[PDB]
Structure formats: C-alpha cells, structure tokens
C-alpha cells in the first residue's frame, strides 16, 4: 500500500548528457514512528506527488 519514490535525473554539466538516474532519497518522509492514521496521511501525499509526476 506504499507508492514508489521517483527516480531523479543527473545532469552532467560538461557534454550536457544525462549521467544516470538514482532514486530521490533526501526528500523522503520518515514515517517509521507513525500509527495507522498518520501512515495513511503520509502515504496520501506520496500518492499526490506521484500523480503530479505522472501528469
């Protein structure tokens, strides 16, 4: 019941190419001490940012 974190791109300033893509750690909500009510609120705004990125 958890959505996935989006893969963010890496821009190489010389040659302008893309240097691979890692997942977006550093923008992750630490839900590891939330009950069943806050976990649904946190995973809703994770499903909101994926819905923006799919558009």
């Amino acid at each position: 019941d958890a959505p996935v974190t989006p893969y963010i791109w890496q821009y190489q300033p010389q040659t302008g190419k893309a240097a691979g893509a890692r997942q977006n750690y550093g923008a992750v909500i630490n839900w590891l001490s939330a009950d069943n009510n806050m976990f649904h609120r946190v995973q809703t705004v994770n499903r909101a940012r994926n819905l923006i990125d799919e558009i």
């Binding site: 590891l32 001490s33 939330a34």
Partner: protein
C-alpha cells in the same frame, strides 16, 4: 605547590591555580541527546513506537 625549592630549606611558595568546577551552562551533557546507542523513549503505553 613549591614555586622553587633547593633541597630542604630555601624554598618559595606560590598558591595553586584557581580551578572552578561546577555544572555546565544549561546542564549541557547531563542528558543523552543525539546518542543513538542510548536514547529517550517518550511514547504512549503499549510502546510500539517512540
């Protein structure tokens, strides 16, 4: 603490350095903050998560 001394008698004294020992400012270090081996655990009962 004997600022000088020649072998028994003709010594000169000097008082020791002043050394104030008290607690820290705001009691820093009394309480384990940011020590991942041993932290605090404020939570509800049935401690499933702090």
């Amino acid at each position: 603490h004997f600022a000088d001394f020649v072998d028994d008698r003709r010594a000169t004294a000097a008082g020791n350095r002043p050394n104030y020992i008290g607690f820290r400012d705001n009691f820093i270090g009394m309480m384990y903050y940011n020590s991942g081996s041993n932290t605090g655990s404020f939570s509800s009962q049935t401690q499933q998560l702090n």
